[PDB]
Write a protein that binds this ligand. Structure first.
Ligand SMILES: Nc1nc2c(ncn2[C@@H]2O[C@H](COP(=O)(O)OP(=O)(O)OP(=O)(O)O)[C@@H](O)[C@H]2O)c(=O)[nH]1
Ligand SMILES: Nc1nc2c(ncn2[C@@H]2O[C@H](COP(=O)(O)OP(=O)(O)O)[C@@H](O)[C@H]2O)c(=O)[nH]1
Ligand SMILES: [Mg+2]
Lengths: 267, 270
């Protein structure tokens, strides 16, 4: 099964570090890091990488340059035209007479990383999310969760949800566990939805914690553990993605692609 | 007994009001800004207090809404307009026939604290553009905000990339004085520690057997006045009477004189 995940967010939020933390990949060996003088008028670029994880083929669609430019002069075009190009390619393939094994390149999920350093959503965040929330499944993510205390974390989560309601942003909603699964799957589902949006911490480094060498971030005053749910929501994000991959695919096909198909097939 | 005018330039919610309250060990009443301001607004607030045995008329100037707009081309203009306005009113005082320079309230910006967001890469596009517009008008002190975000290894390399970028782009930042031999070595390490990695907090956490201003995390306690944790104590040394006087003198003898030459020749003087 194919799965394409798009990553969008201000540069320097730990995006690459979190993504590699999810599946222990090295998706960014050669990485163009421009100077400040260079990113004054930096265009948004699409960089896609495909890796096999256990088993499925995972594609990460990164968007370097997003937010770097001083001005935004259609800074969403390259991203939107990419999303539409994958829709357009699927429609052309499934419409062919000798369609055979169809390679699904449609974007199934878009992680939008939100800065923890502000009070909430910036106008660029709202404009972009409203620009693609009818095209892809938006998963808002609070990057660098270790910059927030627990009370600051609760406030930022509640406010982001309220501003999403305020601007009528359509984000991916986890399916309610149909009254058939175990009590375990029922509790996990309402727990994941109660922690949205996920505030996460990524790390490519080993630290000592509770007498074990685990991934995390080291400070003079303490250690942040990646896999500690009492520190950040990394496990809740990773579990959410794995257990809901198929549903993200299904909503992509049934909602966004069909809406694209109609919105195009007429004229 | 003199005035001191601090300009705070940073992104919305970066910790500007907190760091001000932490520097002066008080709380100035300010309101949390939103991210949906159409333009950058310059908002000054004057306070009468004593810091380091000085009758201080402190004005804290905040560039409200900085970094929030989708399009930020001319974001520096309201900041330069304010700085130039204070140079202008001062020059009008000098050009008066019947003057009153000793009673005049000096409203010129003496320090600009430029909060740099702790991304961990180099400088943002808005930081480079704005500092290049401000470096010949104010004494810029670059600081890395919310430095309790950056581990010590990342912070070391982060400072180098920031300073390296100011050098290669030619951004003149303030330098603590090295002339007087008594404060030569100490100011040498103050300049060497730029940009200051600061942490602001007015909440008091009990550490050991003392209430210390700090930030409480599930994994630890970041002590504001711990110099192993951050550079707050080093930054606060700008508020000693010696450094305040030097920041005012550079303002007058360098930045204001450059403005003065431009205005007077514009006015027609030779
Ligand atoms: N991690 C971390 N958080 C901080 C630090 N200083 C302040 N904060 C938090 O950041 C939030 C922003 O605080 P403010 O100082 O009011 O924000 P601001 O920079 O004044 O920006 P405006 O609201 O537009 O005036 C506060 O809720 C603080 O709890 C810091 O040093 N480190
Ligand atoms: N405080 C904090 N810093 C992080 C975290 N994850 C990554 N970083 C640091 O942020 C810096 C830039 O991270 P990077 O993953 O390259 O950001 P990206 O540009 O969004 O891909 C690096 O120095 C990381 O070590 C986190 O969860 N918390
Ligand atoms: Mg404030």
């Amino acid at each position: 099964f194919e799965f394409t995940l798009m990553v969008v967010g201000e540069s320097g939020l730990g995006k690459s570090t979190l993504i590699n933390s999810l599946f222990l990949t090295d998706l960014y060996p050669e990485r163009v890091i421009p100077g400040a003088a260079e990113k004054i008028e930096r265009t948004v670029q699409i960089e896609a990488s495909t890796v096999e994880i256990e088993k499925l083929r995972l594609t990460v669609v990164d968007t370097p340059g997003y937010g770097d430019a001083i001005n935004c002069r259609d800074c969403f075009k390259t991203i939107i035209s990419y999303i539409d190009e994958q829709f357009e390619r699927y429609l052309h393939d499934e419409s062919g007479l000798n369609r055979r094994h169809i390679i699904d390149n449609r974007v199934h999920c878009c992680f939008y990383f939100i800065s923890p350093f502000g009070h909430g959503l910036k106008p660029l965040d709202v404009a972009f999310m409203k620009a693609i929330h009818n095209k892809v499944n938006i998963v808002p993510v609070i990057a660098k969760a270790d910059t927030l205390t627990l009370k600051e974390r609760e406030r930022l989560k509640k406010r982001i949800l309220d501003e999403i309601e305020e601007h009528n942003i359509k984000i991916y909603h986890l399916p309610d566990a149909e009254s058939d699964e175990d009590e375990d799957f029922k509790e996990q589902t309402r727990l994941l939805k109660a922690s949205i949006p996920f505030s996460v911490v990524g790390s490519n480094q080993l630290i000592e914690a509770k007498g074990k060498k685990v991934r995390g971030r080291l400070y003079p005053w303490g250690v942040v553990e990646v896999e500690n749910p009492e520190h950040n929501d990394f496990l809740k994000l990773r579990t959410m993605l794995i257990t809901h991959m198929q549903d993200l695919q299904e909503v992509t096909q049934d909602l966004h692609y069909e809406n694209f198909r109609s919105e195009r097939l007429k004229r | 007994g003199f005035s001191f005018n601090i300009l705070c330039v940073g992104e919305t919610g970066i910790g500007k009001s907190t760091l001000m309250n932490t520097l002066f060990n008080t709380t100035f009443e300010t309101e949390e800004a939103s991210h949906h301001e159409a333009c950058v607004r310059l908002r000054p607030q004057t306070y009468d207090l004593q810091e380091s045995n000085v009758q201080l008329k402190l004005t804290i100037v905040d560039a409200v809404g900085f970094g929030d707009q989708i399009n930020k081309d001319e974001s520096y203009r309201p900041i330069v307009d304010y700085i130039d306005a204070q140079f202008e009113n001062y020059l009008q005082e000098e050009l008066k026939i019947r003057r009153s320079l000793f009673d005049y309230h000096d409203t010129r910006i003496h320090v600009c604290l430029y909060f740099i967001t702790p991304t961990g890469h180099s400088l943002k596009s808005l930081d480079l553009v704005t500092m290049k517009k401000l470096d010949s008008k104010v004494n810029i002190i670059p600081i890395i905000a919310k430095a309790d975000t950056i581990s010590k290894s990342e912070l070391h390399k982060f400072k180098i990339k920031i300073m390296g970028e100011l050098v290669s782009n030619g951004v003149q930042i303030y330098q603590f004085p090295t002339d007087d031999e008594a404060v030569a070595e100490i100011n040498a390490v103050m300049n060497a520690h730029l940009p200051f990695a600061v942490v602001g907090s007015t909440e008091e956490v009990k550490v050991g057997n003392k209430l210390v201003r700090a930030r409480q995390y599930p994994w630890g306690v970041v002590q504001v006045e711990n110099e192993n944790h951050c550079d707050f104590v080093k930054l606060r040394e700008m508020l000693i009477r010696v450094n305040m006087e030097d920041l005012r003198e550079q303002t007058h003898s360098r930045h204001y004189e450059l403005y003065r030459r431009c205005k007077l020749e514009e006015m027609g003087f030779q």
